[PDB]
Design a protein around this ligand. Structure first.
Ligand SMILES: O=C(O)CNC(=O)C(=O)O
Ligand SMILES: O=C(O)CNC(=O)C(=O)O
Ligand SMILES: [Zn+2]
Ligand SMILES: [Zn+2]
Lengths: 14, 338, 338, 14
């Protein structure tokens, strides 16, 4: 549910 | 490992040789190199496993890029450039540095125009200094007309089909990477799907599957080096990281024209070959496909990685302070789950 | 510890003596015994710290209760009765036993009429068997008229005021507890506010504050002995539970007419005095006050206990299987937070 | 928030 959600963080500045 | 070096056409000799590769403590097996028309390549991508595609023409227009061409055409925008005294360019998140005041990075970021970068690079070579630079900048609208033209000539037909076939989200950015020979980006994982398009020079890519989380010891989520491995590949501390003795990697050397699929959550270590000149790469980062309506048990490793990240985040915000995450987790497990 | 035993009125001698107390590895300091009209008693309750109140008259009508009176008047309902071969009556949650098939309890539950309980108890005494019984049953509408009358005569005025002053939720139940001399309920915490009203005989109550979580090693939340300490007080395994060597308890002996406030999340170990005859107690369990709109940082220990319980629950449901909670938590912390 | 929420479990059957 909420726990499975993922972000979009990578080795660069947003 | 990488295998026998490829022979460049017209009998121009080996593209590289094993002595240009750094030496590490773990075994590796090669990533498959295949045609984009090979069904096995679709099968690997579909199953979120790495593959090197040799004939996508993804960035065909850019293969003519070198510093002079880019300096002449890439515009007057600011480019982020990292500077280090070691070959390792460990990434750090600036926003999180407030959480950990005791973290002082070993590389510094500096904004500059492209010609300034070329100048510093030229200057270092002239006096044989040991300083190392790594330009990493996302392509933006400020680039000049000929770079726009090159960009428009990328193989969007092919990659758009991939984006659609896999149900991925939007392209979030293209990172231009220009490095000095010997530069290393230490092992880390990214939360986006990545098509790594090599343009100039050669890079050795060592990948580890998400299920090796236990062997690679990422920093705490709140730490500036979130998603990077704490293990120093050059000198692994087996006392703190015992399971790094079990790590096994999938490795390959990409050169001009190759495209490497780095699936989301796969660890990757990337090094520009020693004595190989500068390297140029452009990446293609896509948001992953939405979480499926129906969940299949047991969960995949990358789903468990996502759960652990979210537990760490939730606890940081609930406790009001990320430095309390560790003590609570230990108190939660000692004598209970261990 | 408990201190000098109280002298019973009319010069009837010491209520009990230290030889009726079991011997343990840790130090204790006494719980204050005060009048319900003492402002210090309100201050302790308000601050969620234990206090023995000596003159509430909370269960004054019940002080005449013994087995004959209860057998004659408590009705024809079923009473849960626990049976063990040891003095320790470790509580276990029947619903959770499916999660852990390798758990076989050392006490068994049996439903019976009150006169059957009195009979088994009478039978054991006659032949000096070692079996031990502990009746624990929530009072319900099936009780007979004279017990209703006694129940109606409890000091509701006083306790209702307490419920209102503290913002507690509703009274959820009254547990009748009847035990044999020497019976022990091992250390555990409850998630409700408890006024423990002693009626017959003497019980030594040893309490530990929520901040001692790290010293008391509760079972995993999914385990049937959730909220109970894994430490065997009689033979503590310091190799698995090293911080049990730091535990410090608040202890008292309650007798007829005393009421002990056991605040929510406080650990308590309760033993019926050796050679003291049967004990009778009625508890009063209230839902705790709602979580406040504004949270003050840093959080209280019992708030952190609540967070840890919820992490364990969430992970059990997210992983699809509670036995995977441990491996994920270890993988989350080893080489990262420890 | 959600994490702070508590139950009503005690050493007796619901
Ligand atoms: O090329 C490098 O040195 C690093 N690149 C990445 O981590 C990436 O593209 O995800
Ligand atoms: O009296 C006993 O043996 C046990 N009682 C409790 O745990 C309680 O009232 O919360
Ligand atoms: Zn990366
Ligand atoms: Zn209890």
């Amino acid at each position: 549910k909420f726990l499975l959600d993922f972000g979009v963080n990578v080795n660069a500045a947003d | 490992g990488s295998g026998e070096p490829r022979e460049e056409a017209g009998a121009l000799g080996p593209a590289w040789d094993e002595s240009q590769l750094r030496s590490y403590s773990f075994p590796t097996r090669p990533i498959p190199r295949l045609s984009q028309s090979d069904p096995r390549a679709e099968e690997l991508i579909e199953n979120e496993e790495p593959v090197v595609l040799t004939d996508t023409n993804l960035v065909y227009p850019a293969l003519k890029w070198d510093l002079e061409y880019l300096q002449e055409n890439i515009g007057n925008g600011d480019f982020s450039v990292y500077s280090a005294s070691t070959h390792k360019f460990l990434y750090y998140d600036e926003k999180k540095m407030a959480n950990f005041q005791n973290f002082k990075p070993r590389s510094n970021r500096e904004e500059m125009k492209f010609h300034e970068f070329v100048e510093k690079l030229q200057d270092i070579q002239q006096r044989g200094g040991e300083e190392r630079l790594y330009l990493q900048q996302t392509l933006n609208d400020t680039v000049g007309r000929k770079i726009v033209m090159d960009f428009l000539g990328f193989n969007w037909n092919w990659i758009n089909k991939q984006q659609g076939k896999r149900g991925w989200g939007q392209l979030t950015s293209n990172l231009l990477l220009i490095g000095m020979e010997g530069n290393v980006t230490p092992a880390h994982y990214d939360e986006q799907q990545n098509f790594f398009a090599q343009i100039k020079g050669y890079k050795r890519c060592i990948l580890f599957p998400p299920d090796q989380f236990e062997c690679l010891y990422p920093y705490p989520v709140h730490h500036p080096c979130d998603r990077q491995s704490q293990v120093d590949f050059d000198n692994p501390d087996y006392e703190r990281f015992p399971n790094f003795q079990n790590v096994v990697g999938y490795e390959t050397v990409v050169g001009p024209g190759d495209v490497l699929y780095i699936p989301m959550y796969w660890w990757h270590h990337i090094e520009s070959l020693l004595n190989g000149g500068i390297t140029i790469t452009v990446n293609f980062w896509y948001k992953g496909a939405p979480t499926p309506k129906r969940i299949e048990y047991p969960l995949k490793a990358h789903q468990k990685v996502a759960i652990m990240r979210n537990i760490e985040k939730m606890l940081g915000e609930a406790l009001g302070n990320p430095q309390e995450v560790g003590p609570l987790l230990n108190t939660m497990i000692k004598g209970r789950y261990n």
